[PDB]
Design an enzyme around this catalytic site. Structure first.
Site, PDB file in Angstrom:
ATOM      1  N   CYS B 105       2.425  -1.537  -6.901  1.00 59.07           N
ATOM      2  CA  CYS B 105       2.186  -0.191  -6.365  1.00 59.07           C
ATOM      3  C   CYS B 105       1.483   0.658  -7.417  1.00 59.07           C
ATOM      4  CB  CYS B 105       3.484   0.517  -5.932  1.00 59.07           C
ATOM      5  SG  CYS B 105       3.237   2.142  -5.040  1.00 59.07           S
ATOM      6  N   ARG B 108       2.755   4.898  -8.075  1.00 59.04           N
ATOM      7  CA  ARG B 108       4.090   5.169  -8.598  1.00 59.04           C
ATOM      8  C   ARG B 108       4.158   6.371  -9.512  1.00 59.04           C
ATOM      9  NH1 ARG B 108       6.003  -0.443 -11.027  1.00 59.04           N
ATOM     10  NH2 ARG B 108       3.729  -0.789 -11.192  1.00 59.04           N
ATOM     11  N   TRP B 277       0.871   7.729   1.427  1.00 56.00           N
ATOM     12  CA  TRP B 277      -0.464   7.976   1.931  1.00 56.00           C
ATOM     13  C   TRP B 277      -1.413   6.934   1.359  1.00 56.00           C
ATOM     14  CZ3 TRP B 277       1.866  11.855  -1.149  1.00 56.00           C
ATOM     15  CH2 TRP B 277       1.399  11.897  -2.481  1.00 56.00           C
ATOM     16  N   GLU B 282      -7.951   0.654   0.392  1.00 57.69           N
ATOM     17  CA  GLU B 282      -7.254  -0.215   1.344  1.00 57.69           C
ATOM     18  C   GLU B 282      -7.954  -0.194   2.691  1.00 57.69           C
ATOM     19  OE1 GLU B 282      -2.676   0.329   0.898  1.00 57.69           O
ATOM     20  OE2 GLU B 282      -3.549   2.255   0.228  1.00 57.69           O
TER      21      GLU B 282
HETATM   22  C1  HEM Z   1       2.391   8.221  -2.053  1.00 61.41           C
HETATM   23  C2  HEM Z   1       1.281   7.477  -2.221  1.00 61.41           C
HETATM   24  C3  HEM Z   1       1.233   5.928  -2.390  1.00 61.41           C
HETATM   25  C4  HEM Z   1       0.123   5.262  -2.756  1.00 61.41           C
HETATM   26  C5  HEM Z   1      -1.250   5.909  -3.082  1.00 61.41           C
HETATM   27  C6  HEM Z   1       0.409   3.842  -2.795  1.00 61.41           C
HETATM   28  C7  HEM Z   1      -0.477   2.826  -3.146  1.00 61.41           C
HETATM   29  C8  HEM Z   1      -0.270   1.471  -3.003  1.00 61.41           C
HETATM   30  C9  HEM Z   1      -1.269   0.415  -2.897  1.00 61.41           C
HETATM   31  C10 HEM Z   1      -2.796   0.620  -2.921  1.00 61.41           C
HETATM   32  C11 HEM Z   1      -0.627  -0.760  -2.797  1.00 61.41           C
HETATM   33  C12 HEM Z   1      -1.272  -2.151  -2.619  1.00 61.41           C
HETATM   34  C13 HEM Z   1      -1.358  -2.228  -1.099  1.00 61.41           C
HETATM   35  C14 HEM Z   1      -2.062  -3.430  -0.557  1.00 61.41           C
HETATM   36  O1  HEM Z   1      -2.832  -4.040  -1.318  1.00 61.41           O
HETATM   37  O2  HEM Z   1      -1.873  -3.758   0.643  1.00 61.41           O
HETATM   38  C15 HEM Z   1       0.799  -0.500  -2.785  1.00 61.41           C
HETATM   39  C16 HEM Z   1       1.830  -1.423  -2.702  1.00 61.41           C
HETATM   40  C17 HEM Z   1       3.180  -1.108  -2.595  1.00 61.41           C
HETATM   41  N1  HEM Z   1       3.736   0.156  -2.458  1.00 61.41           N
HETATM   42 FE1  HEM Z   1       2.778   1.925  -2.821  1.00 61.41          FE
HETATM   43  N2  HEM Z   1       1.737   3.698  -2.436  1.00 61.41           N
HETATM   44  C18 HEM Z   1       2.282   4.948  -2.165  1.00 61.41           C
HETATM   45  C19 HEM Z   1       3.595   5.204  -1.759  1.00 61.41           C
HETATM   46  C20 HEM Z   1       4.639   4.300  -1.742  1.00 61.41           C
HETATM   47  C21 HEM Z   1       6.032   4.563  -1.381  1.00 61.41           C
HETATM   48  C22 HEM Z   1       6.555   5.934  -0.912  1.00 61.41           C
HETATM   49  C23 HEM Z   1       6.706   3.397  -1.499  1.00 61.41           C
HETATM   50  C24 HEM Z   1       8.194   3.097  -1.263  1.00 61.41           C
HETATM   51  C25 HEM Z   1       9.126   4.058  -1.255  1.00 61.41           C
HETATM   52  C26 HEM Z   1       5.772   2.378  -1.964  1.00 61.41           C
HETATM   53  C27 HEM Z   1       6.046   1.049  -2.228  1.00 61.41           C
HETATM   54  C28 HEM Z   1       5.119   0.025  -2.377  1.00 61.41           C
HETATM   55  C29 HEM Z   1       5.431  -1.379  -2.475  1.00 61.41           C
HETATM   56  C30 HEM Z   1       6.864  -1.978  -2.432  1.00 61.41           C
HETATM   57  C31 HEM Z   1       4.281  -2.038  -2.607  1.00 61.41           C
HETATM   58  C32 HEM Z   1       4.094  -3.550  -2.779  1.00 61.41           C
HETATM   59  C33 HEM Z   1       4.356  -4.283  -1.491  1.00 61.41           C
HETATM   60  C34 HEM Z   1       3.766  -5.648  -1.681  1.00 61.41           C
HETATM   61  O3  HEM Z   1       4.098  -6.277  -2.725  1.00 61.41           O
HETATM   62  O4  HEM Z   1       2.982  -6.114  -0.806  1.00 61.41           O
HETATM   63  N3  HEM Z   1       4.538   2.974  -2.086  1.00 61.41           N
HETATM   64  N4  HEM Z   1       0.971   0.854  -2.928  1.00 61.41           N
HETATM   65  C1  LIG Z   2       4.346  -5.513   2.812  1.00 57.26           C
HETATM   66  N1  LIG Z   2       3.023  -5.096   2.303  1.00 57.26           N
HETATM   67  C2  LIG Z   2       3.105  -3.882   1.459  1.00 57.26           C
HETATM   68  C3  LIG Z   2       1.936  -2.987   1.753  1.00 57.26           C
HETATM   69  C4  LIG Z   2       0.872  -3.513   2.453  1.00 57.26           C
HETATM   70  C5  LIG Z   2      -0.212  -2.715   2.763  1.00 57.26           C
HETATM   71  F1  LIG Z   2      -1.252  -3.266   3.424  1.00 57.26           F
HETATM   72  C6  LIG Z   2      -0.226  -1.377   2.374  1.00 57.26           C
HETATM   73  C7  LIG Z   2       0.834  -0.844   1.658  1.00 57.26           C
HETATM   74  C8  LIG Z   2       0.846   0.607   1.308  1.00 57.26           C
HETATM   75  C9  LIG Z   2       2.067   1.272   1.414  1.00 57.26           C
HETATM   76  C10 LIG Z   2       2.153   2.634   1.157  1.00 57.26           C
HETATM   77  C11 LIG Z   2       3.473   3.362   1.260  1.00 57.26           C
HETATM   78  C12 LIG Z   2       1.001   3.320   0.811  1.00 57.26           C
HETATM   79  C13 LIG Z   2      -0.207   2.632   0.718  1.00 57.26           C
HETATM   80  N2  LIG Z   2      -1.346   3.319   0.394  1.00 57.26           N
HETATM   81  N3  LIG Z   2      -0.275   1.308   0.996  1.00 57.26           N
HETATM   82  C14 LIG Z   2       1.923  -1.654   1.361  1.00 57.26           C
HETATM   83 CL   LIG Z   3      -3.056  -0.986   5.545  1.00 55.56          CL
END
Ligand code: HEM
Ligand SMILES: CNCc1cc(F)cc(-c2cc(C)cc(N)n2)c1
Ligand SMILES: [Cl-]
Ligand code: HEM
Ligand SMILES: CNCc1cc(F)cc(-c2cc(C)cc(N)n2)c1
Ligand SMILES: C[C@H](O)[C@H](O)[C@H]1CNc2nc(N)[nH]c(=O)c2N1
Ligand SMILES: C[C@H](O)[C@H](O)[C@H]1CNc2nc(N)[nH]c(=O)c2N1
Ligand SMILES: [Cl-]
Ligand SMILES: [Gd+3]
Ligand SMILES: [Gd+3]
Ligand SMILES: [Zn+2]
Lengths: 401, 401
Positions: B105, B108, B277, B282
């Site tokens: 992520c 974070r 968001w 993505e």
């Molecule tokens: C608020 C703005 C946030 C942004 C900009 C963001 C951004 C991202 C991005 C770009 C990824 C990779 C996604 C992908 O390649 O499909 C990701 C993965 C992830 N995000 Fe964040 N995220 C946000 C919020 C959150 C929140 C609120 C949570 C949980 C409370 C979270 C938990 C995770 C987890 C667990 C992953 C990895 C899941 C996996 O391994 O496939 N994110 N995030």
């Molecule tokens: C089980 N796959 C995890 C996953 C896949 C995916 F395609 C997108 C995101 C994701 C989640 C959040 C909260 C924000 C963001 N910008 N992307 C997470």
């Molecule tokens: Cl998506």
């Protein structure tokens, strides 16, 4: 016990059984992954056997008369001397294999086309310089680049080593100012000060080709001024941004790495410069756009009148793509061999399938095979990979200071 | 203690937080498997013991009255029932740690600002639908997006699990075609088949929002249409390419992941959907340009009058940059929160600096953190990272079918 490896673009699956043979333990443990870190007495005998065994199986000659005999003569060689010399064809086999084993090299579809220059009968810097200058001219070939390695004498106990003091044969200068900051390439500020120390006079340019520093066993290094006609360079122009040429950028034609230690079958060759041809993102993205390299990104963007006041205009991405176009175009107009990252990565996918059929896998380092722009637009991005150490290998080594 | 270098600036730190890594990942010294996408009362005690120890360090009450009381409680609850119950503040902390600990992520920096909805009293799929609708409503917030997580009842001995069968709360259908192709999103062909098999009436557009398949303990999954006005979407247009609006492209506002398991102190919450968001890459690079997704790259480049017959013109990189521009502009036009990959990676560098002082490190997956376009143009490219598993955590789990 054999890593399952998936391709996410197509869904295909292979198993990397070749990883079973890994020798030199990597930096990773089940507890933490360190895959993104850049630089993370008769042992000679066991390394020696399995190299010779590699050679003969590679030529369908295992368990055969010349295999038995070559195993004895190396065993006999080490007995008397505590070291051994390689048969010329073996040195040819090790050089190509060490290339084939390089996990971070994206151009190994070419691994079998390699010209090896044997320079083992060498002494004194003036000799190397001639060997180096024959490589460079052979390799440049008036822009029709050809992969070549020159191998200098192996390492001996109780005596100095052959070492080149530059990371590459061609490097641009790095000069400080009344304010520290570098004019020229900031990568090579440390070797620029070593050269100016050893007699050279600083130019005033951003593209002054550095002098070589060549060091023979136990004798102090010697400067060498490379011949200008032997250093092929390509002025950078853009096909449609007429002002780009006026920015005055250049890059040299030959990527020729002169600080890696070739290890074949037990022996370690600290001076063995190899060369091939550039991938365009190497020049256009890393060398000219890295914040600590030439860092031209902002200057190109002003000239294209892009909005540099908000990162969400992707002005960085726009100017970077054009810097890469100008590289590909300037090299093609100069008729120098160069490869774009789309062509290079697709051939690497070919290389992977070749190596799956031949050897049951291929060590590949994902973070170095994926290009540094447009990653997920290339199929290596969607390819899972396995990283490990096979031998023979190219290795990093301490700087000789 | 792994030494970690930032190559743009030259810094060196040591990831001491990694020495605490619990569950073991995919790598050995023989081989790195970092690029793979998917890598008894006594032990529920040690896991919960550690989480409780964490929660009490965070409130600055380490080694106190309440601290030993809560431990004594939990071992009494495990002995008597085989499990235990989180207090509400413990649950808020555990869910914010889980996000903080999530190595892939990049968002974070925001881990502390999270709105936790406690739905552990949910009694059926119908009530589960209502908590979810409320979640989407709060988090969407008319385009001013807020980070939220709803936590449904924990896995427990005797009854099945709550599950959301959908991988995200908002997904577009993927229908297979007469000519084998897919209309809509091919990542969602499987879930789409299930919705129809469970009595959904499919459409035939490319951007059809899927219904929700919600599973109460020891129930078949139940279908639920999401109310149209609850799902905020964004038509995609380009600031300057006015033909772009004619592609008919849309994406939704809320990224709401619903198929992961949240683990806090050995307790397992198989249904705890979470949302923040989008980062523009993505949508623009992966969802729209991946060859196995909407795969619009070639069609955008033809329209742009790019030369699609040679890759050396960099038509792919150029078209992909304008697709990203379009995504950002469209989301700003519609006043829907979005972050581009330069701002997102810049705030992540700040997160690593915050986390080094606070915890002595940060678990980071380099290949997921670096954007899929413009990698070395972002500061994270040049930063070495240590990947490992900390608890609390979000984990992958098999699809319940
Ligand atoms: C608020 C703005 C946030 C942004 C900009 C963001 C951004 C991202 C991005 C770009 C990824 C990779 C996604 C992908 O390649 O499909 C990701 C993965 C992830 N995000 Fe964040 N995220 C946000 C919020 C959150 C929140 C609120 C949570 C949980 C409370 C979270 C938990 C995770 C987890 C667990 C992953 C990895 C899941 C996996 O391994 O496939 N994110 N995030
Ligand atoms: C089980 N796959 C995890 C996953 C896949 C995916 F395609 C997108 C995101 C994701 C989640 C959040 C909260 C924000 C963001 N910008 N992307 C997470
Ligand atoms: Cl998506
Ligand atoms: C002929 C065209 C070639 C291309 C396009 C190519 C491409 C590349 C690239 C892009 C890298 C990444 C280097 C970096 O970003 O710092 C690399 C690394 C490497 N190349 Fe190749 N290469 C070629 C030929 C060769 C040859 C002829 C050899 C040796 C015989 C070789 C051996 C290596 C090794 C050992 C590395 C790893 C060095 C390191 O990890 O720092 N390459 N190559
Ligand atoms: C000392 N670091 C190894 C290194 C660094 C580097 F910047 C470039 C290359 C390289 C080498 C060859 C033969 C072709 C090519 N295209 N690149 C190798
Ligand atoms: C820290 C990170 O691993 C480092 O910047 C690597 C990433 N991948 C790379 N890949 C190549 N080809 N060359 C490099 O210098 C790097 N740098
Ligand atoms: C095989 C490869 O690791 C796979 O395509 C990964 C690469 N890195 C990624 N990185 C992010 N952030 N998201 C992804 O979906 C992927 N896919
Ligand atoms: Cl280079
Ligand atoms: Gd003007
Ligand atoms: Gd117009
Ligand atoms: Zn690893």
């Amino acid at each position: 016990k054999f890593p399952r490896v998936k391709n996410w673009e197509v869904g295909s699956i292979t198993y990397d059984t070749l990883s079973a043979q890994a020798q030199q333990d990597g930096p990773c443990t089940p507890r933490r992954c360190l895959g993104s870190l850049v630089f993370p007495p008769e042992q000679l005998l066991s390394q020696a056997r399995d190299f010779i065994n590699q050679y003969y199986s590679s030529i369908k000659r295992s368990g055969s008369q010349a295999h038995e005999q070559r195993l004895q003569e190396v065993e006999a060689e080490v007995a008397a001397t505590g070291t051994y010399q390689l048969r010329e064809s073996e040195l040819v086999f090790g050089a190509k294999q060490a290339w084939r084993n390089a996990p971070r090299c994206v151009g190994r579809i070419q691994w079998g086309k390699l010209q090896v220059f044997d320079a083992r009968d060498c002494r004194s810097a003036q000799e190397m310089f001639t060997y180096i200058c024959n490589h460079i001219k052979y390799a440049t070939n008036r822009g029709n680049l050809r992969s070549a390695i020159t191998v200098f004498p192996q390492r001996c106990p109780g005596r100095g080593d052959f070492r080149i003091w530059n990371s590459q044969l061609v490097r641009y200068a790095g000069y400080r100012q009344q304010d520290g900051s570098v004019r020229g390439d900031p990568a090579n500020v440390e070797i620029t000060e070593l050269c100016i120390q050893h007699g050279w006079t600083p130019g005033n340019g951003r593209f002054d080709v550095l002098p070589l520093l060549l060091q023979a066993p136990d004798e102090p290094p010697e400067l060498f001024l490379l011949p200008p006609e032997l250093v092929l360079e390509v002025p950078l122009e853009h096909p449609t941004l007429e002002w780009f040429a006026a920015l005055g950028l250049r890059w040299y034609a030959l990527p020729a790495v002169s600080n890696m230690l070739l290890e074949i079958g037990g022996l370690e060759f600290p001076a063995a410069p190899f060369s091939g041809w550039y991938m365009s993102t190497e020049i256009g993205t890393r060398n000219l756009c890295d914040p600590h390299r030439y860092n031209i990104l902002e200057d190109v963007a002003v000239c294209m009148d892009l909005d540099t006041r908000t990162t969400s205009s992707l002005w960085k991405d726009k100017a970077a793509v054009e810097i890469n176009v100008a590289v590909l175009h300037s090299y093609q107009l100069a008729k120098v061999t160069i490869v774009d990252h789309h062509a290079a990565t697709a051939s690497f996918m070919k290389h992977l399938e070749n190596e799956q059929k031949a050897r049951g896998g291929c060590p590949a380092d994902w973070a170095w095979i994926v290009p540094p722009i447009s990653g997920s637009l290339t199929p290596v991005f969607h390819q899972e990979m396995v990283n490990y150490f096979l031998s023979p290998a190219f290795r990093y080594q301490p700087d000789p200071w």
